[PDB]
Design a protein around this nucleic acid. Structure first.
Lengths: 117, 117
DNA sequence: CGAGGCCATCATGGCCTC
DNA sequence: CGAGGCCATCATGGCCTC
């Protein structure tokens, strides 16, 4: 039922590092449409986001975003966990920023909302 | 009997990469005193070496050297294998150049020969 | 082909601080 | 302590060529 990773199509644009203290500035979260609508507003505010888009991903929503400062993926996961409870919530750092966004606007993906195009 | 790696004291200065196409310019070979005396002259010539020292390492000899151009560790191993046969021959790339040399001049290590100090 | 170069990418982990 | 930043190091592997 609930996804356990991102969609194969996306997996190459993503960091899967487990033992890294690396900070980055582009992230994506996979969760339910309604949790993603909430996190859109909350994440935008928390991280003074430079950009943030919400996307349809299969039965669900992918939040994509970039931040003025860097964060550990863990830190953003710990932040989102404080806002609500989630059936699933998968939070991953984005290695290939432009290519993640492009594909999430493309298909089987749609834009729902975004602070620019 | 014959060593199967370099001495623990040295292991941190060394590359242990198995699946890398990386080229570098500083190497060390662990082998018998007599194979090392041979490779000293031969390695110097083959690689137009910028520097090369031979060292006493326990019952044995460590060849240390730097090259004007870069090489895969594998390439230098393949070269040394063409010169003779060896009871053991351990060829490794050197990550920390200065610190490898310093320690090999230090102790339980001595210089035997070197194209400078 | 496969030996032996090139490079960009990014995970590892040491370190530091509130 | 331990969350969450910083960075330098260097292994991975894609690519290319004789």
């Amino acid at each position: 039922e609930d996804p356990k990773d991102f969609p194969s199509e996306l997996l190459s644009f993503l960091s899967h590092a487990v033992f890294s203290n690396r900070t980055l500035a582009c992230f994506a979260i996979y969760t339910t449409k309604e949790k993603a609508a909430l996190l859109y507003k909350k994440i935008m505010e928390k991280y003074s986001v430079t950009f943030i888009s919400r996307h349809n991903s299969y039965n669900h929503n992918i939040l994509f975003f970039l931040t003025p400062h860097r964060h550990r993926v863990s830190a953003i996961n710990n932040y989102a966990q404080k806002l609500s409870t989630f059936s699933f919530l998968i939070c991953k750092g984005v290695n290939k920023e432009y290519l993640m966004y492009s594909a999430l606007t493309r298909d089987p993906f749609s834009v729902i909302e975004e602070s620019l195009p």
